Amino acid sequence: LSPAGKISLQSFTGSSLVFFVICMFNHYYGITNLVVNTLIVFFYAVNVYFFLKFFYNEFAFAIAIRAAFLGLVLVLGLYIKLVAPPNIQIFGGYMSVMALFHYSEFLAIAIVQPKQVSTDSFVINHSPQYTIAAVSSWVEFFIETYFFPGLKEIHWLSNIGLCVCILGEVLRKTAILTAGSNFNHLVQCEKSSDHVLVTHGVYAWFRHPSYVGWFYWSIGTQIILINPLCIPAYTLASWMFFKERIYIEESMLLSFFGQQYCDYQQQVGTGIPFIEGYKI
Amino acid sequence: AVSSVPTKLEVVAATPTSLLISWDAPAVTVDLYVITYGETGGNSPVQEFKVPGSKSTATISGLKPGVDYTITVYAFSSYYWPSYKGSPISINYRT
Ligand SMILES: Nc1ncnc2c1ncn2[C@@H]1O[C@H](CSCC[C@H](N)C(=O)O)[C@@H](O)[C@H]1O
Ligand SMILES: CCCCCCCC/C=C\CCCCCCCCOC(=O)[C@H](O)CO
Ligand SMILES: CCCCCCCCCCC
Numbered sequence: 420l421s422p423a424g425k426i427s428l429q430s431f432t433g434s435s436l437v438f439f440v441i442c443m444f445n446h447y448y449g450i451t452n453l454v455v456n457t458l459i460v461f462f463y464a465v466n467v468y469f470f471l472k473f474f475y476n477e478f479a480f481a482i483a484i485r486a487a488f489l490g491l492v493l494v495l496g497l498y499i500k501l502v503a504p505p506n507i508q509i510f511g512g513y514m515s516v517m518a519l520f521h522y523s524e525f526l527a528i529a530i531v532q533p534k535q536v537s538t539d540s541f542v543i544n545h546s547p548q549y550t551i552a553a554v555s556s557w558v559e560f561f562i563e564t565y566f567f568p569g570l571k572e573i574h575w576l577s578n579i580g581l582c583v584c585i586l587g588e589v590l591r592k593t594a595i596l597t598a599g600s601n602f603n604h605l606v607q608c609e610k611s612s613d614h615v616l617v618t619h620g621v622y623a624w625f626r627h628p629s630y631v632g633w634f635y636w637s638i639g640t641q642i643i644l645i646n647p648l649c650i651p652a653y654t655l656a657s658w659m660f661f662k663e664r665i666y667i668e669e670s671m672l673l674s675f676f677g678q679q680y681c682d683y684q685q686q687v688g689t690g691i692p693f694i695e696g697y698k699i
Numbered sequence: 700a701v702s703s704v705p706t707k708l709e710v711v712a713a714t715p716t717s718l719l720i721s722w723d724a725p726a727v728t729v730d731l732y733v734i735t736y737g738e739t740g741g742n743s744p745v746q747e748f749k750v751p752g753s754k755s756t757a758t759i760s761g762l763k764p765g766v767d768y769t770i771t772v773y774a775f776s777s778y779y780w781p782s783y784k785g786s787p788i789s790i791n792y793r794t
């Protein structure tokens with residue numbers, strides 16, 4: 420695929436392979452201490468940072484190091500899910516789901532829209548309120564797992580969170596592929612000379628299938644963690660953000676395609692409950 | 700432009716009926732802007748239009764000479780999570 424797309428794929432899988440070997444070695448040799456595993460990973464994390472900076476220029480390295488970091492998180496997540504105490508294994512699957520989301524998001528844009536692929540395509544915030552929400556779900560888990568270890572040992576509940584995240588991920592990426600170059604991480608206020616209306620595929624089910632997948636995926640992450648406080652908070656925060664986003668987004672779509680989108684609003688719903696869009 | 704919202708909103712050049720406005724784009728990625736302009740304390744609702752998030756200027760026409768106006772810039776960005784509309788910046792200018 421695109422050059423920037425190949426850089427991310429080489430770094431992501433290469434980094435995944437490197438730390439896969441490290442974790443395999445640490446497991447078969449009984450290397451169990453959390454801080455020893457931390458320093459072994461940190462040691463080689465430094466090596467990948469400097470080998471990549473040597474082989475890539477500024478633009479490519481910015482992409483490569485993020486892809487390598489996400490591969491690191493992926494393997495460490497699966498590593499934790501397999502070997503950590505049942506009190507903690509849940510967090511490993513959450514880490515892996517998160518890493519795959521952000522990387523596959525970059526790869527989708529690289530496949531579908533090579534012209535504007537940037538470090539922003541990893542869709543990482545990098546927003547104080549958003550970062551607090553993310554960290555607050557980490558502290559809830561570990562505070563709750565310390566006082567109520569049995570809560571995080573209900574693996575069938577967490578695996579339900581796995582299912583909705585996979586489903587939401589499939590829905591999301593399919594939408595990006597179906598929309599082609601009509602997709603964009605940034606809402607467009609001006610009509611491109613090649614921008615056409617998409618009403619087939621998952622766009623026949625929902626008007627905003629990528630937001631539907633993102634909406635349920637985000638809730639799913641907190642079902643994985645079995646976080647009783649973050650699940651409703653994430654649901655509401657997610658819901659209000661897409662209500663605002665969809666509202667302005669459909670006002671621009673009506674000016675783009677006029678009655679074609681008006682007819683599309685009458686035939687297909689948004690896909691998120693209680694969000695109507697730019698319509699009565 | 701260290702701020703996370705639009706700053707340094709200003710009329711650069713003006714004619715009795717039109718304005719050339721400009722602002723400092725925030726340090727964050729902006730999808731689009733919404734520009735509003737209306738007669739300061741007028742009876743009519745204000746006007747509105749959109750400019751791409753990559754631009755930092757706009758032009759307003761059809762204004763009455765010698766009238767006080769209030770202009771406001773709204774940035775839309777994922778940085779404002781869980782909101783999508785950002786905090787506004789306003790100025791006043793008499794044509
Ligand atoms: N049905 C459609 N057909 C073509 N483009 C669409 C579209 N719906 C939204 N878009 C465009 O896609 C960009 C956002 S990407 C998100 C697309 C859609 N809201 C979804 O969730 O699947 C916006 O700039 C918007 O103009
Ligand atoms: C592995 C992760 C999960 C992947 C999920 C796969 C998607 C499953 C959902 C829909 C599959 C669509 C196939 C049938 C289309 C028929 C449409 C029209 O139908 C009709 O009109 C016929 O009468 C139906 O019989
Ligand atoms: C393991 C995922 C690899 C994705 C490669 C996609 C390449 C798309 C090329 C389009 C012509």
Ligand SMILES: CCCCCCCCCCC
Nearest residue numbers: 442443446494497498501
């Ligand atoms: C994909 C990461 C593999 C890390 C090694 C885990 C081996 C543990 C197996 C216990 C069933």
Ligand SMILES: CCCCCCCCCCC
Nearest residue numbers: 552555558559562648652
């Ligand atoms: C059990 C510790 C409680 C701290 C986490 C509260 C989560 C509230 C979500 C607000 C984003």
Ligand SMILES: CCCCCCCCCC
Nearest residue numbers: 559562563564565566567
């Ligand atoms: C000193 C009192 C300690 C009480 C422990 C209760 C734990 C509640 C976790 C939410």
Ligand SMILES: CCCCCCCCCC
Nearest residue numbers: 688689690691692694695
């Ligand atoms: C997840 C799909 C549930 C149905 C919600 C559709 C609401 C659209 C109203 C416009």
